RNA sequence: UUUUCCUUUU
């Protein structure tokens, strides 16, 4: 960073993978711009970006929503004589599925065989990933199958990824044979492994269960995660337990375990359906102070709970100071104040918000549509 | 030096 500068004063020139290792922080930050200020810059020094540059590149602009800036950058490295290695390819394999783009995804993966390229056990997990969120469970198993004749070998990713599969399709004891399986093969469950099942037993209205397995895995040493107590705040809050999913918030704290932003997005969440809306805003005020900034899932969760309430100005308020404050609104905020307005017969209202919706370029999808009092 | 798994909102 500074000490980058530093180093560059001192006449010594720095090897690419310096470069890179830089770009790549920069990336993980959010100052994406300067990443690539800092790629133009060494354009201007001469000094050679490589493949793992792209790479890099392609994924944060990937990571930020900028799916088509990362698609001209991997145009440009073609062109360039740069080959788009297998990372590459894992890459916007990835993005792509993201993006819900699963067809597009899957003729990369045909692209990348047709330059010699083998897919390896990361083109496999983000592929049987992507194909599990898109329902096609029975695909992610055949793709399964697949990489065991090509010859890799399913790992802790990959046996995580089919589990949590399972799990979203009520195939819950069928995770736990995996779950078996993957001891049976000398994978080591991660926290992780146990955080999908305990929420695959949550959705399945097995909180029982859920805690136990909570309690074994501290037993068999895996320290818990926030991810975990965020699982089992959320279980408990469906359940109507918001009480001693209170009582978990402060457990976890005692614990080490630093709540954040999801921590207070869920709990807000629930105090909000329970309509303790007293609660959630005091709970929103909380975060800001603590540091937690809001994103937009605190805003569209605050939103509905105003909305469902009849609140509706109170709900206009938080999305004039969330697009104030920089946080950007997205399908899910258009959906829920057109929502909140066709329910109350403000039908105008709503057909306006629809209309200023598209001039922010973001994509209305059925529901949208789905909603009207009209019929 | 770069890519893949789990939790929250309509």
Redesign the pocket.
Same mark, same amino acid.
């Given at each position: 960073l500074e000490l980058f500068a530093e180093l560059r004063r001192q006449g010594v020139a720095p090897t690419? %993978?310096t470069? #890179?290792?830089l770009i790549?922080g920069l990336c993980?930050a959010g100052k994406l711009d300067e990443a690539l200020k800092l790629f133009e810059e060494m354009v201007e020094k001469g000094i050679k970006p490589?493949?793992?540059?792209?790479?890099?590149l392609?994924?944060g602009l990937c990571?930020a929503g900028k799916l088509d800036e990362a698609l001209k950058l991997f145009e440009e490295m073609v062109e360039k004589g740069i080959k788009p290695?297998?990372?590459?390819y !894992?890459?916007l394999?990835?993005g792509l599925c993201?993006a819900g783009k699963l067809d597009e995804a899957l003729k990369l993966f045909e692209e990348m065989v047709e330059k010699g390229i083998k897919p390896?056990?990361? =083109?496999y !997990?983000?592929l049987?990933?992507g194909l599990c969120?898109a329902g096609k469970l029975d695909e992610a198993l055949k793709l399964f199958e697949e990489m065991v004749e090509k010859g890799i070998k399913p790992? *802790?990713?990959?046996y !995580?990824?089919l589990?949590?599969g399972l799990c979203?399709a009520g195939k819950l004891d069928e995770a736990l044979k995996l779950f078996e399986e993957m001891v049976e093969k000398g994978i080591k469950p991660? %926290?992780?492994?146990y955080? =999908?099942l305990? &929420?695959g037993l949550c959705?399945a209205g097995k909180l029982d269960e859920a805690l136990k397995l909570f309690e074994e895995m501290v037993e068999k040493g895996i320290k818990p995660? %926030?991810? =975990?107590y #965020?699982?089992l705040? &959320?279980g408990l809050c469906?359940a109507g337990k918001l009480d001693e999913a209170l009582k978990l918030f402060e457990e976890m704290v005692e614990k080490g375990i630093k709540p954040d932003?999801?921590?207070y !997005? =869920?709990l807000?969440?629930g105090l909000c359906?329970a309509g303790k809306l007293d609660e959630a805003l005091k709970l929103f005020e909380e975060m800001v102070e603590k540091g937690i900034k809001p994103?937009? *899932?605190?805003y569209?969760?605050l939103?509905?709970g105003l909305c469902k309430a009849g609140k509706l100005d109170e709900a206009l308020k938080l999305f004039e100071e969330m697009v104030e404050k920089g946080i950007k609104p997205? %399908?899910?905020?258009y #959906?829920?104040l057109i929502?909140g307005l066709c329910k109350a017969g403000k039908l105008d209202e709503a057909l306006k918000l629809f209309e200023e919706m598209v001039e922010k370029g973001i994509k209305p999808?059925e529901?949208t549509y789905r909603r009207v009092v009209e019929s």
């Open positions: 690419v %993978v470069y #890179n290792t790549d993980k490589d493949v793992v540059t792209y790479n890099t392609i994924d990571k290695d297998v990372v590459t !894992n890459t394999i990835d993201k390896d056990v990361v =083109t !997990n983000t049987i990933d969120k790992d *802790v990713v990959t !995580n990824t589990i949590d979203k991660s %926290v992780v492994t955080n =999908t305990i &929420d959705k995660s %926030v991810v =975990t #965020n699982t705040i &959320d469906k932003v999801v921590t !997005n =869920t807000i969440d359906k994103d937009v *899932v605190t569209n969760t939103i509905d997205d %399908v899910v905020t #959906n829920t929502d999808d529901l």
